[PDB]
Design a protein around this nucleic acid. Structure first.
Length: 298
DNA sequence: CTTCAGCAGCACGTAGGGGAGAATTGG
RNA sequence: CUUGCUCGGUUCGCCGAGACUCCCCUACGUGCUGCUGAAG
DNA sequence: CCAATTC
């Protein structure tokens, strides 16, 4: 299940004011700082509407509006498994420690010597009762079935300065027959360069790639990022994820690249089939500005 | 003005916790 | 094989060779440096 | 149609 990466193009507001991220942050902050008894007291986080509703009242965690059971479940199981996992880490060493102590004691008993004393344990709780190596908050925003990427159809999605695509039409191809371009137009290969061009099948880089306009010791062309990007989203494929009043729109060109180098798909493929190769629950990075996808089992 | 000694990391590892849905269903 | 990333050739028009299991977190070595004390 | 249920 390899991962595939995708860049963002627009969003309503920064992914920090989202109810999902705020609720996950509050839940984590509450759970990580629990005592080894309060963990078992508040560990009956439910799976239904009523159980997950009454847990928030019992534990008092602020709720910013988020109520999705599928979206409130993915940010409680992870938090409690991380809490339990730190204890699992501090108790993993003690298993081999006890095994080694038992082996040494058995060897001494066989030799006749009395068993040697060993350290009891290295627990994870200090005088305050809380946990020593308290975990850090995960900024990842995990998606779910109810909110899955779909083709950006402007029928209901809001008005953006973007283009539109047919989910049924096959995906466009990257300027076939490169050596037919008028002079003075983007992508033009001068005549001296046409001899000794690559004949093997490889990635077809676009004119407005960032690798062709970048600072380099022997590159005298001037970098114009403002135009290099403003003329780069015209040929973009837009996929949209939507939780509430939020409308992340992405670029399904990373997905298109991903499907073409693991022996998966060819130029004859519609948008619906493109993201039908991927799991419907991507992971979002609020600070880096990237979305991560995963293939299916096939 | 040389050896140490218990701490911190702009950076590199490592080591070990956690994680990365969808099909059947109900107002 | 349209975005993204790495390394390069160029008349600067874009050309070539690549990698693609990723993220988060708490610890912990290393020179670097800082903070003290022994040593003629 | 689209939030909630088990797996």
């Amino acid at each position: 299940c390899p991962p595939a990466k995708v860049n963002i193009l627009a969003q309503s507001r920064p992914l920090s004011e989202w109810p999902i991220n705020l609720v996950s942050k509050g839940v984590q902050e509450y759970v990580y700082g629990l005592t080894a008894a309060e963990r078992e007291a508040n560990g009956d986080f439910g799976t239904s509407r009523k159980s997950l509703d009454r847990w928030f009242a019992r534990t008092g965690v602020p709720t910013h509006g988020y109520t999705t059971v599928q979206g409130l479940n993915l940010i409680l199981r992870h938090t409690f498994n991380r809490y339990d996992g730190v204890i699992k880490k501090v108790e993993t060493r003690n298993e081999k420690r006890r095994s080694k102590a038992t082996r040494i004691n058995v060897s001494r008993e066989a030799d006749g010597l009395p068993p040697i004393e060993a350290e009891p344990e290295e627990t994870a709780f200090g005088p305050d009762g809380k946990l020593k190596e308290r975990p850090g908050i995960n900024p990842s925003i995990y998606c779910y079935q109810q909110v899955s990427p779909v083709p950006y159809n402007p029928a209901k999605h809001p008005a953006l300065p973007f283009s539109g695509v047919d989910p049924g039409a096959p995906l466009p191809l990257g300027t076939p027959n490169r050596l037919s371009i008028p002079k003075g137009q983007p992508g033009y290969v001068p005549e001296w360069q046409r001899p000794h061009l690559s004949t093997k099948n490889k990635r077809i880089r676009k004119w407005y790639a960032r690798a062709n306009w970048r600072r380099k010791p022997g590159r005298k062309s001037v970098l114009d990022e403002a135009k290099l990007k403003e003329a780069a989203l015209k040929e973009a494929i837009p996929i949209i994820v939507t939780i509430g009043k939020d409308w992340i729109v992405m670029d399904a060109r990373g997905l298109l690249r991903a499907v073409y180098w693991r022996g998966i798909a060819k130029p004859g493929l519609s948008l619906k089939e493109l993201l039908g190769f991927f799991s419907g629950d991507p992971v979002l990075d609020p600070k880096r500005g990237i979305a991560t996808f995963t293939f299916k089992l096939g």
